[PDB]
């Protein structure tokens, strides 16, 4: 019946592949039943099997992506699919440190000129 991704998370790659193959075989059997005048109870399991295949693939892909993200966490150049997907304009924006950069003249002006806190008596 309905698998639990909580439980599947602990399994290993080979185990997940095996379970995916079992689910696919069961789906093929149910598809045969569909054409060969299958019972309504039998046909009602197709949706569950399909969503179970979806769950297994979800877990597999999530674990693979986590491993790859960890692997490339420190490389200067990362694969395109492992980079931040903000908007294109946001990606073209300057970095925070580049924005914070100030020239020597601006630093000197910051040192010398600094607004004070004051009030005016009415």
């Amino acid at each position: 019946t309905k698998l639990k991704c909580k439980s599947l998370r602990g399994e290993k790659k080979d185990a997940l592949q095996k379970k995916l193959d079992e689910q696919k075989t069961e789906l093929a059997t149910l598809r045969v039943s569909k054409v060969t005048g299958g019972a309504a109870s039998k046909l009602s399991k197709i949706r569950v099997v399909r969503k179970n295949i979806a769950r297994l693939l979800t877990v597999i892909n999530q674990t693979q992506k986590q491993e790859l993200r960890k692997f490339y966490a420190d490389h200067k150049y990362k694969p395109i699919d492992l980079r931040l997907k903000k908007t294109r304009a946001i990606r073209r924006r300057l970095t925070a440190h580049e924005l914070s950069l100030r020239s020597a003249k601006q630093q000197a002006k910051s040192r010398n000129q600094a607004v004070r806190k004051f009030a005016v008596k009415a």
Binding site: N112, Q113, A114, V115, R116, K117, F118, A119, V120, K121, A122
Partner: protein, 155 residues
């Protein structure tokens, strides 16, 4: 076909004016928005005056108006020197500096010098670091009566 005694028509409506129409249904909305902007600015820069920099006194240019004075853009460097205020210091303590205006008459220079003097008298300067005051900074109980000023500074 005008008939009888009439004033000759003058209405400038021969262009496709229906493509350029401006209504004023958002006048109260704009009023509210500007009040809210002033409130936000006051919260941001408290206790400094909401109006902002202090402006100078100015004679209206032409002889039709020269008997009236009004707020100018800022204080000329001659006036700042006469009041003994550096331009750099004025920018910090919130006084507008008009780098284009120059004084050619003692009375005009003196009016603005006096204005600067009274502003300095009314000024309250907070210590740069609250823990440690310095020379020039206002006194402790003076810093308690500090309140945000609304409207023009020295109207």
């Amino acid at each position: 076909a005008p008939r009888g005694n009439q004033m000759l028509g003058n209405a400038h409506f021969r262009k496709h004016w229906h493509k350029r129409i401006k209504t004023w249904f958002d006048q109260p909305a704009r009023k509210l928005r500007r009040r809210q902007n002033r409130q936000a600015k006051a919260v941001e820069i408290a206790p400094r005056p909401v109006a902002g920099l202090l402006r100078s006194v100015v004679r209206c240019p032409q002889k039709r108006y020269n008997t009236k004075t009004r707020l100018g853009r800022g204080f000329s460097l001659q006036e700042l020197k006469a009041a003994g205020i550096s331009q750099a210091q004025a920018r910090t303590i919130g006084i507008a500096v008009d780098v284009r205006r120059t004084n050619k008459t003692a009375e005009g220079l003196k009016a603005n010098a006096d204005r600067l003097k009274e502003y300095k008298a009314k000024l309250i300067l907070f210590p740069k670091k609250a823990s440690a005051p310095k020379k020039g900074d206002s006194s402790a109980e003076e810093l308690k009566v500090a309140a945000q000023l609304r409207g023009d500074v020295l109207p």
